[PDB]
Write a protein that binds this ligand. Structure first.
Ligand SMILES: *C(=O)CSCCNC(=O)CCNC(=O)[C@H](O)C(C)(C)COP(=O)(O)OP(=O)(O)OC[C@H]1O[C@@H](n2cnc3c(N)ncnc32)[C@H](O)[C@@H]1OP(=O)(O)O
Lengths: 156, 5
């Protein structure tokens, strides 16, 4: 796959490199994220990563974990993004494949994410990995248009 | 892209 054939290095997110994630998020997403987002992303440990290409931080995947009463793990992908000059060369796939590999180590894992309903490019990207649109939430986002999201998910 | 939280 495309993620297996790009020279990328992944690093975990910690307090010492948190500013890199904050800059990426400021550029990539119109949603403003607060301290709870950053605490959740760090607490997801191996599921949250920064991506480095040509020794520059160019993307990230940030997750939030929840343990269900069944004992199964639910993984939320909170954010996934790659800086525009470095898109289309496998970095997003590398980040997502890393999370999918971490999920395969937890039995009966399920993964959920939210995507704006007009983000046709991202929807196509996720469908390649086996994700499906399973729901729509009206008025999910406050200030952007459209305000609706798809809930996109994959079960293991 | 999760909403603000
Ligand atoms: C909430 O955060 C979750 S939903 C929001 C997702 N993020 C977002 O929309 C921000 C802007 N886009 C990106 O950051 C980035 O484009 C991703 C994360 C959507 C994908 O990252 P890459 O661009 O690094 O992905 P690749 O691993 O190269 O594969 C891309 C696959 O997606 C389609 N495609 C083709 N050319 C594309 C370009 N230039 N940009 C984005 N998407 C592209 C194709 O289906 C392609 O398939 P491959 O054959 O490349 O695997």
């Amino acid at each position: 796959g495309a993620g297996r054939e790009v020279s990328v290095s992944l690093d975990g997110v910690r307090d010492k490199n948190l500013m890199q994630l904050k800059i990426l998020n400021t550029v990539l997403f119109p949603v403003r994220y607060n301290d709870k987002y950053y605490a959740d992303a760090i607490a997801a440990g191996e599921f949250t990563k920064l991506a480095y290409y040509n020794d520059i931080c160019v993307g990230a995947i940030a997750c939030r974990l929840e343990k269900k009463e069944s004992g199964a793990m639910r993984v939320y992908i909170m954010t996934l993004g790659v800086l525009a000059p470095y898109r289309g060369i496998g970095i997003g796939s590398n980040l997502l494949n890393h999370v999918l590999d971490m999920c395969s180590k937890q039995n009966m894992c399920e993964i959920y994410l939210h995507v704006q309903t007009n983000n046709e490019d991202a929807i196509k990207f996720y469908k390649k990995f086996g994700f499906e649109i399973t729901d729509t939430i009206q008025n999910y986002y406050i200030n952007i248009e459209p305000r609706d999201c798809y809930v996109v998910s994959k079960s293991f | 892209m999760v909403n603000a939280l």
